[PDB]
C-alpha cells in the first residue's frame with residue numbers, strides 16, 4: 001500500500017488524480033465537503049473558510065437558487081487559493097449523445113469549471129464515451145458510481161464489477177469511483193465515499209451513515225464526502241476539522 | 257387489451273396518465289417529440305408546429321443555452337393550446353434528500369412546469385420518495401427507467417423487475433416507465449420507448465434504434481419517443497406525421 005503522495009507519481013496516474021493526491025498529502029486532508037446549500041454566498045463563505053481543511057468541494061449546481069457562471073469563477077479563485085478540486089455531483093446517466101451536451105452546454109457549462117464529474121454506469125459505456133469527448137480536450141476527470149449509500153441501492157454484485165471494468169477500460173478519463181469501499185485493486189483509482197457521519201444514523205429518505213474510521217480504515221476508501229454532518233453543525237469549520245482528522249488518521253493507520 | 261380512451265378511465269389511473277391517455281385518443285397520437293435543441297426559439301417553433309401531431313414534448317432543459325422560466329411559460333401556453341404533456345427527461349438518480357431539491361429548486365424549478373419527470377431506480381426507492389414529496393402536492397407524475405435503449409445497458413433481468421415493483425408500490429406518483437417494451441401487466445401504467453427511428457441503425461455513442469412497428473406492435477409499448485429521426489429531418493412536421501401514423505397504426509393493429 002502506497003501513500004497518497006506516492007500514488008500521485010504512479011505511471012498510469014491521471015493528471016487530475018495526481019493533482020488531487022499531491023494536495024491531499026501536502027494539506028493532510030482526505031475530506032470532500034458536500035456543499036449542499038441553495039445560496040451562492042453561503043457556498044463561497046464555506047469554500048473560503050473550509051478550503052484549508054478539504055481536498056475537494058462537491059457541488060450540486062442545479063440546487064443553487066442564484067447560480068451564475070460568475071459564482072463558479074469566484075469558487076475557482078478559492079479552489080486555486082486554498083488548493084482543492086471542484087467536483088460537480090451531476091450523476092450523468094443518459095445516452096452518450098445527450099450527456100456530452102449536458103456536460104459542455106446549457107446554462108451551467110459544467111465542463112468549464114468542474115475538475116471532476118461523475119456518471120452512473122447503468123446506460124452502458126456510451127455514457128463515458130460521450131462525456132470523455134468533452135472532458136478529455138478540457139483535461140477533466142470522471143468518477144463512476146460503483147456503489148451507493150442509499151437504502152435499496154441496486155449498485156451491488158455484478159453491477160459494481162461492471163463499473164470497475166468500465167473505469168479500468170476508460171482510464172484516460174475515469175480517475176476513480178463513488179463507492180462505499182475499495183472496489184478496484186489498482187492504486188491509480190480514487191475511492192470517494194459519501195454517506196459519512198461520526199454518529200450512527202440516517203435520514204428520512206434512505207440515506208445511511210457510516211463513520212470515517214469504518215469507510216477509510218475498515219473498508220479501504222480514500223476520501224470521505226460529508227454534507228449535513230458539517231453543513232448543519234453550528235461551527236462548520238470545527239466540524240470540517242473533526243471529519244478531516246478522523247479520515248486522515250484512519251488513512252495513516254491503514255498505511256502502518 | 258383496452259384502448260387509450262378506456263385506460264384513461266381505469267379505477268387506479270393517475271390524473272396525469274388519464275389526461276395524457278384522453279388527448280392521445282382524441283388526437284390519434286402516441287408520439288412524444290424529443291425536442292433535443294439548444295435554442296429556445298427552435299424549441300418553441302417545433303412545439304407550435306408539431307403540437308397537433310404529438311401527445312408529449314420531452315425536454316432536456318439543461319442543454320438549452322438560453323433557458324429562462326419565461327421560455328417554459330411560453331412552452332406551457334403551446335402545450336395547453338395544442339394539448340400535449342411536458343416531460344423533462346432529467347433522469348433523477350441521487351439520494352431522496354438531494355433529488356427533492358433538484359426537482360423543486362435551483363434555476364430550472366422543474367416541478368413548476370413539467371407534467372412528468374423520470375428517475376433511475378438504481379439508488380433504491382428513496383429517489384421516488386424524495387421526488388414524490390415535491391411532485392404529489394404539485395399534482396405531477398413520474399416515470400421509472402426500467403430499460404434503456406443504449407448499448408451495454410445494465411437495466412435488464414432483476415433490475416427491470418425492481419423498477420416495475422418500485423412503480424407498482426408508488427402508484428400515487430409513478431404513472432409508468434421508460435422501457436423498450438411492455439414491462440408491467442397493469443394497464444394503468446404507461447410505457448414510453450426511446451431509441452426509435454423508421455430506418456435500422458444507431459449513433460456513434462451507443463444509441464440503438466428500433467422501428468415504431470417493432471416497439472408498439474411487437475413489444476407492446478404505448479408511446480414512441482423520437483429525437484433525431486424528426487429533429488434532423490428537413491421537414492420536421494412531415495417527419496412527425498410519419499412517426500405519428502406509424503405508432504398509431506401499430507397501436508390499432510395490436511387492439512384488433
Ligand SMILES: O=c1ccn([C@@H]2O[C@H](COP(=O)(O)O)[C@@H](O)[C@H]2O)c(=O)[nH]1
Pocket residue numbers: 034036060089147148149150178194195196207225226227228229350351354
Ligand atoms: O451514493 C451516494 C452518492 C452521492 N451522494 C451525495 O453525497 C451527499 C451526501 O450528503 P449528506 O452527508 O448530507 O448525507 C449528497 O450531496 C448526495 O447527493 C450520496 O449521499 N450518496
Ligand SMILES: O=c1ccn([C@@H]2O[C@H](COP(=O)(O)O)[C@@H](O)[C@H]2O)c(=O)[nH]1
Pocket residue numbers: 094095098290292316345403404405406434450451452463481482483484485
Ligand atoms: O433509454 C433511453 C432514455 C432516454 N433517451 C433519450 O431519448 C432521446 C433519444 O433521442 P434520439 O431519437 O435522437 O436518439 C434523447 O433525448 C435521449 O436522452 C434515450 O435515448 N434512451
